[PDB]
Amino acid sequence: TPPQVLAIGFFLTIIIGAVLLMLPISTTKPLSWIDALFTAASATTVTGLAVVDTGTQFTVFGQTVIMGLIQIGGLGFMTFAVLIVMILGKKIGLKERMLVQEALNQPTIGGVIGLVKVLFLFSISIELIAALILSIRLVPQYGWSSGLFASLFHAISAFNNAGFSLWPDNLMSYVGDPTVNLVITFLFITGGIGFTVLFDVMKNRRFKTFSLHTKLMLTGTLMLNAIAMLTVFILEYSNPGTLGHLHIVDKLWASYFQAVTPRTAGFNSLDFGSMREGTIVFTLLLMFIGAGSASTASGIKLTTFIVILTSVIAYLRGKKETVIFRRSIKYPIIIKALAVSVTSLFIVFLGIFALTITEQAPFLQIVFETFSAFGTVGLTMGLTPELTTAGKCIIIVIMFIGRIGPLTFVFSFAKTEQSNIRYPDGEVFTG
Amino acid sequence: TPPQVLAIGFFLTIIIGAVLLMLPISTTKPLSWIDALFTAASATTVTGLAVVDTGTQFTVFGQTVIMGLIQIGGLGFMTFAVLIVMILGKKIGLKERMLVQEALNQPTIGGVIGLVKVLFLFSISIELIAALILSIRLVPQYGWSSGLFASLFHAISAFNNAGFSLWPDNLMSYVGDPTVNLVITFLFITGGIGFTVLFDVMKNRRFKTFSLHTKLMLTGTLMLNAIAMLTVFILEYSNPGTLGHLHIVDKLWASYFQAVTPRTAGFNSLDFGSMREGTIVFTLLLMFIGAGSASTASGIKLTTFIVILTSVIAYLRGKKETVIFRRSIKYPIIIKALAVSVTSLFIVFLGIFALTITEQAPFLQIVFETFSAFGTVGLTMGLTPELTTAGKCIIIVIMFIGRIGPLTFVFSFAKTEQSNIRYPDGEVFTG
Amino acid sequence: KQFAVIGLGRFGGSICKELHRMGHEVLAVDINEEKVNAYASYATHAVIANATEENELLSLGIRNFEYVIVAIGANIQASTLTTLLLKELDIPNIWVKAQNYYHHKVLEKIGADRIIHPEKDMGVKIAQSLSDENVLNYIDLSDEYSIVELLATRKLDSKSIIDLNVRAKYGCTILAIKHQDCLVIMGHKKDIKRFENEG
Amino acid sequence: KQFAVIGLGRFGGSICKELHRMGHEVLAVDINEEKVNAYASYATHAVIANATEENELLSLGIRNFEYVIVAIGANIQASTLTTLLLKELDIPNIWVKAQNYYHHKVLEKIGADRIIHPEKDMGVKIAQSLSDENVLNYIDLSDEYSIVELLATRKLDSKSIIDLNVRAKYGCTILAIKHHGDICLSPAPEDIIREQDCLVIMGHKKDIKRFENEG
Amino acid sequence: KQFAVIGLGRFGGSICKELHRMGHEVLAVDINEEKVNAYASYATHAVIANATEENELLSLGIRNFEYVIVAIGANIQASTLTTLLLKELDIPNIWVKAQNYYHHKVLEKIGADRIIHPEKDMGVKIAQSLSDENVLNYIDLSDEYSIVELLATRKLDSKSIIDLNVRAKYGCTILAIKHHGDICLSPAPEDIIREQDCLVIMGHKKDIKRFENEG
Numbered sequence A, B: 001t002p003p004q005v006l007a008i009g010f011f012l013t014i015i016i017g018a019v020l021l022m023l024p025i026s027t028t029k030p031l032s033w034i035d036a037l038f039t040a041a042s043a044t045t046v047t048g049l050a051v052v053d054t055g056t057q058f059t060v061f062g063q064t065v066i067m068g069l070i071q072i073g074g075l076g077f078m079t080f081a082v083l084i085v086m087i088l089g090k091k092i093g094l095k096e097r098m099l100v101q102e103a104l105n106q107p108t109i110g111g112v113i114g115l116v117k118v119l120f121l122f123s124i125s126i127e128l129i130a131a132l133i134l135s136i137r138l139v140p141q142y143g144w145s146s147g148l149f150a151s152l153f154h155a156i157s158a159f160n161n162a163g164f165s166l167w168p169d170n171l172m173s174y175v176g177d178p179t180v181n182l183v184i185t186f187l188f189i190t191g192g193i194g195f196t197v198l199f200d201v202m203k204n205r206r207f208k209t210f211s212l213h214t215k216l217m218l219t220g221t222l223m224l225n226a227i228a229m230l231t232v233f234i235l236e237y238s239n240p241g242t243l244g245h246l247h248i249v250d251k252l253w254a255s256y257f258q259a260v261t262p263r264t265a266g267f268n269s270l271d272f273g274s275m276r277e278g279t280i281v282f283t284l285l286l287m288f289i290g291a292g293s294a295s296t297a298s299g300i301k302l303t304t305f306i307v308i309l310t311s312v313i314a315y316l317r318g319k320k321e322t323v324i325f326r327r328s329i330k331y332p333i334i335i336k337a338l339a340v341s342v343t344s345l346f347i348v349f350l351g352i353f354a355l356t357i358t359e360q361a362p363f364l365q366i367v368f369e370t371f372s373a374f375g376t377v378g379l380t381m382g383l384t385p386e387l388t389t390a391g392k393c394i395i396i397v398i399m400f401i402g403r404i405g406p407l408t409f410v411f412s413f414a415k416t417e418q419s420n421i422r423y424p425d426g427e428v429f430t431g
Numbered sequence C: 001k002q003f004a005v006i007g008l009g010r011f012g013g014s015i016c017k018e019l020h021r022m023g024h025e026v027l028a029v030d031i032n033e034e035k036v037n038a039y040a041s042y043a044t045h046a047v048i049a050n051a052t053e054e055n056e057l058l059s060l061g062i063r064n065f066e067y068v069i070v071a072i073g074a075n076i077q078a079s080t081l082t083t084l085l086l087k088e089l090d091i092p093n094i095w096v097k098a099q100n101y102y103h104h105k106v107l108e109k110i111g112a113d114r115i116i117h118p119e120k121d122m123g124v125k126i127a128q129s130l131s132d133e134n135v136l137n138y139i140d141l142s143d144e145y146s147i148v149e150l151l152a153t154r155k156l157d158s159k160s161i162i163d164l165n166v167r168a169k170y171g172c173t174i175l176a177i178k179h180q181d182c183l184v185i186m187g188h189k190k191d192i193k194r195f196e197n198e199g
Numbered sequence D, E: 001k002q003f004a005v006i007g008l009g010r011f012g013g014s015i016c017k018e019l020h021r022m023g024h025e026v027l028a029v030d031i032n033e034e035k036v037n038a039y040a041s042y043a044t045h046a047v048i049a050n051a052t053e054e055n056e057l058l059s060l061g062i063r064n065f066e067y068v069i070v071a072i073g074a075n076i077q078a079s080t081l082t083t084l085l086l087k088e089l090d091i092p093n094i095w096v097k098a099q100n101y102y103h104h105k106v107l108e109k110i111g112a113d114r115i116i117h118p119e120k121d122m123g124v125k126i127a128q129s130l131s132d133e134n135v136l137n138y139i140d141l142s143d144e145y146s147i148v149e150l151l152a153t154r155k156l157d158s159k160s161i162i163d164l165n166v167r168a169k170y171g172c173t174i175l176a177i178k179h180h181g182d183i184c185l186s187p188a189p190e191d192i193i194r195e196q197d198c199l200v201i202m203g204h205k206k207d208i209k210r211f212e213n214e215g
């Protein structure tokens, strides 16, 4: 039932938010029932896949519904539900505390309610400050009415790993601007690093006192962003469409930006449709991996990837246990990481299979779109405006399972029968 | 060192075959040093990827070298090494018996030499019988010098899951032919099912007396080939390029042939380049799975797929152990399987990444080429003749690792560091 | 018919192997992991379960078995708790192996359909062969008449059946001869002993 | 310096916490899984290993440590076998915790650099406080000279330093006088002793006992 | 020659290390995981198995070994059931380490090709060295004849071979003289016997006793 409440509550926010976009106030142009359902699902799953341009199709009131759906969907459904109950004064019971444990994927119920106090207070604080930092740049270019709203929309969009942009070019006009680059890359790196990581970073100011998870995320993000920045710069250095007609200073900005955006924001500074096939392949591995076990990002998390990678290498070297940072890792941690990875690959395989039946599109665009939808990144090669009505319905199901997590979606409708009986061992050869 | 001997011995047969194919006697046309090495490596790794046509480029002696490479690499390097030792009368020691246990992927050394006598006797028995059955059809069409040789070449090629064919159209002139379809599909199904599965059915004639591995392979092969037959027939029923201008009887034969040939024979009745993208995507999953741990096929095996799939499904159902056919499957089985599947996906991903850098080709053909080379299937969408000198070197590496196995290739250069020390448990969130 | 044998000891392990030899569906339950692994090949279904728990007993589908044999005869707590559960699950036929006279009396109260003493029935059968070495096997039709498979002594060699007056003098009916040759006889318990003494 | 503590008992676990408090690299080796999980956070590196085995000892890089403290003092076999390994590995300082007189003599033969009796040393210090309740803590400079932190009684209340004849009659020097959380190093004549205060004194061992009985 | 050693104790582990040193294919079987990991480097292949079970015995590949050594000598049940399976498997040579006299009687019945008493045979050899301090090592050719490696006393110092009338008086022939670490096979008359040099002397079992006593 704790996975059932999350699944029901997440879907209802799509349906409730879809009606708010269908109103004539929300949009300038008529909006289809599937485009409104896609944009509602692309916001509460915090993906950023846009059938129609967000700035032009929607009015100010329509974009205010977007910010509400991004904020509610970015921090999780049960995160705001805790605040509502505490405000009204209802007691947070043990039954209500088990939902919060399931929502943050915590193994322990100790201090899980206090983390919601910490994480919501930090989230509203950082989105407010980052808007002020972006206010010094977006206000002289768009006035006070639009510049203040442009900075406020993007601070909520960037921190929650959304990638929605009001402008027709999603951050392609600010390739070389350090103010837009540094502040936004600060938001989705810190917003996707993990809520428990940020709590562990602030309360202990020394690296030796960090938990194993906190040390994994700080080292894992730094290692992965370094390899990704080196790969995009080397592969796309001589490409004419992207990173070719740019200065060496602006080459390093777009290479830095395109390396951190697939995990899992979905902003861009170069056109992904003109990238080489070699760089797109590495982006798929990049955006199949997420960032942070409990954050605003999705996909299989970085700690899941490190656990499986280190467990395989330990086996290949003959070691009998998985050791990261001089810490052994138990069998329940390994099996949950492989259950996430195998379930995610099967669902991505179903999404790629079902789209090739439906869409008449190049294969690399279909593969790039399904990893982007399941990982809730939102990067495109030019397929989302070209989807059919049946093709869009597949992406909505993919984005739903991708944000909610493959395991929690399965636990909703999978019977949990406990049998204490055991069986004799059978030998099978698994070469 | 048992895995180090296999890698060195398997590499020497590539060198020996490349020398024999590059002699002026064994070919009718000039041959490059890479194309001779590619053809030799595609034969001992038993893949069937042909840069050049076998029928025209090579003489009768050259095709006799190919049959030698297919038979040696199909049954394994160490299988013939033991028979040479037994023919010379030399005793089989414990050290020489450990090499056979490694090559056949057996867990114990109990009766590992008696299995070699059975599998060699069964191989030449069924290759001789099937060559006679193919002769009653091939000889009236191509005479006695060519009809008897072509039947002999294909019976050896089919049994060892090679896919080499003398004709320029690889079995595309026998789409509706029941004699060729029945005999050849009977060969690579039994030739790739596993040497231990055949040994178990030969000595035990009742299904309840079979082991878990034998029941996994017999039931798994029946179910997997039935689902693949249903998928090909439904998706390709309206396709104009393949399966469209055919009779209903021929549609059943071609769908049945293409259901079983990706695991891992690589023969064909229809052009895979004119198939839809939906059938190619399902074939990619099909040829990532092989058949039989000790067989002539490659890829991750059918038992590895079922062990991983049941381990996840039991976890998602809340069960505490993996049970197939009322038998518990221990943790050491689950861990090897995971390594075989994770290492194989990493090598396939590196191949697709390296081919996209090198080759200028559609992305669907690059992914199809790497899965076909790693699983040693040999099916092409039309890329192998168009590969470059740098591209063929990558495919040679992929075919080599695919046949010998990712585990035994890593164990060649991975120093098994033994230590009895342990570490305190670590808590990392892998949700 | 489907049979369940709970407890794979020397007694229960024999019933699993014998019923599997005759071609029957046998469920073999034992709390010991190494016992179930040995008898896994000798049973249609073998489970490592504790049968004193009702939750584990319902997991096996124990209600589908007409005959359940509880071959636990050294743990009275495990044996009586098991046959109380099976009586609750409405098993038509529960056959229990007892340990002593008091274990027989508990199981008779809590509803055992048949209570078996394997070592006590064999020990009395062995001690009858120890006391008189002429006998080899016997079956008690009643408390006073038995079909004793006697062994012919040296004085019975080269003696015809018509020479023997067992029909009238001893009142014993010879049934079969298995060529010292086995001599199957039937008569009163006191009457057979007369033929053994006088040859 | 790099320290290794082998055996996380009450004695071994206290050295791990204290050296980690002062900021030192400490390796905590124990054969018990539960002990290592307790001191994993109180040590730079914590390993679950058997120290009587050479293969497990060489895996830790135990040759990189200047000091090894073998805090196994109830298993004589495990304690003596460990320091025989460490002596073979040319460890500069091997400090071993002993159990009885005979365990001390085995470790002396096989080359223990320093042998420690934690409970025997603390038992003697406690038994000096039980015999004489006026003493609180003491340290033996030699077999006849000691620094004793005494406890002031009622007869020493309202008395000055010059009034006390410790320097001349007893031949003992008063070192410091604690006064309710306030300490007076090297008092000058004259300071008034309170009711119950520390009376840190230095002198001959027998001369202090005469001072306690008389005053 | 292929060897399998079942039970890696002090006796079984010594056969594995000595046969592997000579360059023989040794399979080391044990039931203890620590023992198997210890002898992975001293055996061609080391397997964890329980030899009393026949299914685990055929997995090892036990029918391929000409010599099997069952070096279990503390469990009579485990030793006798192992050599019962191996005898039933038509193993040609089974060498079993026994414990007591009744264990020797069981193995003789169930077909052990050779039964070994390592500690009993060494205890008899040691008790000859305790009883007679002159002897160092001896070999019983029979029950009445032996080759004894004696040790030179003070009265044998500066004595030539022909001076010692051992050949006539005792009827014992001196075989070799371990001179100061260098042997002298078949010494010729005469060689000077030093203070402490081994005198390998062959004779009757009673006669060498006279030579030891009379010096």
Ligand SMILES: Nc1ncnc2c1ncn2[C@@H]1O[C@H](COP(=O)(O)OP(=O)(O)OP(=O)(O)O)[C@@H](O)[C@H]1O
Pocket: C006, C007, C008, C009, C010, C011, C012, C029, C030, C031, C032, C035, C049, C050, C051, C052, C071, C072, C073, C074, C075, C078
């Ligand atoms: N609660 C239980 N459920 C199932 N099996 C059990 C239970 N308790 C014990 N057993 C198993 O039952 C088997 C037979 O029981 P036990 O050994 O106590 O009987 P026994 O009197 O020695 O019988 P036998 O002479 O046939 O060996 C044993 O293998 C034991 O592990």
Ligand SMILES: Nc1ncnc2c1ncn2[C@@H]1O[C@H](COP(=O)(O)OP(=O)(O)OP(=O)(O)O)[C@@H](O)[C@H]1O
Pocket: D006, D007, D008, D009, D010, D011, D012, D029, D030, D031, D032, D035, D049, D050, D051, D052, D071, D072, D073, D074, D075, D078
């Ligand atoms: N061979 C060994 N290697 C490593 N640690 C060991 C070994 N043997 C024992 N230990 C551990 O050393 C610690 C201290 O040993 P032990 O408890 O025997 O000594 P002790 O005299 O009782 O010590 P203390 O008074 O400090 O508790 C224990 O935690 C014990 O588990």
Ligand SMILES: Nc1ncnc2c1ncn2[C@@H]1O[C@H](COP(=O)(O)OP(=O)(O)OP(=O)(O)O)[C@@H](O)[C@H]1O
Pocket: E006, E007, E008, E009, E010, E011, E012, E029, E030, E031, E032, E035, E049, E050, E051, E052, E071, E072, E073, E074, E075, E078
């Ligand atoms: N059933 C068995 N199968 C295989 N190995 C066994 C079995 N039982 C015991 N062993 C192993 O045999 C080895 C030697 O046996 P054990 O210690 O009982 O004999 P022992 O006479 O004391 O030997 P030794 O004095 O030479 O060490 C041990 O390492 C033990 O673990």
Ligand SMILES: [K+]
Pocket: A046, A047, A048, A161, A162, A163, A264, A265, A266, A376, A377, A378
């Ligand atoms: K996103």
Ligand SMILES: [K+]
Pocket: B046, B047, B048, B161, B162, B163, B264, B265, B266, B376, B377, B378
């Ligand atoms: K092939």
Ligand code: NA
Pocket: C010, C119
């Ligand atoms: Na019994």
